[PDB]
Design a protein around this ligand. Structure first.
Ligand SMILES: Cc1cccc(Cl)c1NC(=O)c1cnc(Nc2cccc(C(=O)N[C@@H]3CCNC[C@H]3F)c2)s1
Length: 284
């Protein structure tokens, strides 16, 4: 099933994420290998237990470089724990915002290829993520990006960015907002937003537009503008992720292939899409 770990092998050291029902810790697994540790405090309900251990069950079924690896679970003792590999650099959105401009275009594009490879794996495994966003991508000390945040109802319920179904509007495909059609193709729309987040170093999609204004703009055909210093091929790809008609979007296999080709002929990334400025500075 999954690996049951004895509590004596686990040492919690730092809180890296807290919540009402539990906390996420950085720790060590047997003071030897660093791990992340997610707990479930006493008094949890049946639904909370199913959702909590269900996340571990889903992760245990995956084995991919760009998907968070499960080390094991503590279920025989309390509190219960999910133990995974430790991603040293945290969530991608916060990571990019705190390292603004510090990476090359080729590095940024390689992050996107890793994310896409993880999503292609998930889609082929018949797993729809529903909440793909930079905040749900984790980064390690090799700059590898791994898709995180698995489960069923639990995913959108626990994301504060998801607003009342209960979804994160700015990242969500129109068919999923409109009539709750979540598929790998709505994940592709979300991946286009993640592309835009990466190339902007964590800019907030649609900026200060309200949720209703975002839905209104999308339905009227508006799309996010080109990031600064963005390869033309990258902007073209994210625009095709945002096709209103779900059947016109690339599959993840197409995305990975295109990103592979660009990275392997890296001069192709030097052709930038035009950036339309929001300030005019004219000097005599
Ligand atoms: C444990 C677990 C259970 C179930 C699902 C999952 Cl995906 C997990 N694993 C995790 O939640 C995590 C795995 N790795 C994580 N790494 C992480 C997350 C958030 C912040 C940090 C972290 O150390 N962030 C910064 C990095 C730079 N400044 C110092 C640190 F605070 C690391 S969280």
């Amino acid at each position: 099933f999954t690996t049951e770990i004895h509590p004596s092998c686990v040492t919690r050291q730092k809180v890296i994420g807290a919540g009402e029902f539990g906390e996420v810790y950085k720790g060590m697994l047997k003071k030897e290998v660093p791990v992340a540790i997610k707990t479930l405090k006493a008094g949890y309900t049946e639904k909370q237990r199913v959702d909590f251990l269900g996340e571990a069950g889903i992760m245990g079924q995956f084995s991919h470089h760009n998907i968070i690896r499960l080390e094991g679970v503590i279920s025989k003792y309390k509190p219960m724990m999910i133990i995974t590999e430790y991603m040293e650099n945290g969530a991608l959105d916060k990571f990019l915002r705190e390292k603004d401009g510090e990476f090359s275009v080729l590095q940024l594009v390689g992050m996107l290829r890793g994310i896409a490879a993880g999503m292609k794996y998930l889609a082929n495994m018949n797993y729809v993520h529903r909440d793909l966003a930079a905040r749900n991508i984790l980064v390690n000390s090799n700059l590898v990006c791994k898709v995180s945040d698995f489960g069923l109802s639990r995913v959108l319920e626990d994301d504060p960015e998801a607003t009342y179904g209960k979804i994160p509007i700015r990242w969500t495909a129109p068919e999923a907002i409109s009539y709750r059609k979540f598929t790998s193709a709505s994940d592709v729309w979300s991946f286009g937003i993640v592309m835009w987040e990466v190339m902007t170093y964590g800019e907030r999609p649609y900026w200060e537009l309200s949720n209703h204004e975002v839905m209104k703009a999308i339905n009227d055909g508006f799309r996010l503008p080109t990031p600064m210093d963005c390869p033309s091929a990258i902007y073209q790809l994210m625009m095709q992720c945002w096709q209103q008609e779900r059947a016109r979007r690339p599959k993840f296999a197409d995305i990975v292939s295109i990103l592979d080709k660009l990275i392997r002929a890296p001069d192709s990334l030097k052709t930038l899409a035009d950036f339309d400025p929001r300030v005019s500075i004219r000097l005599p």
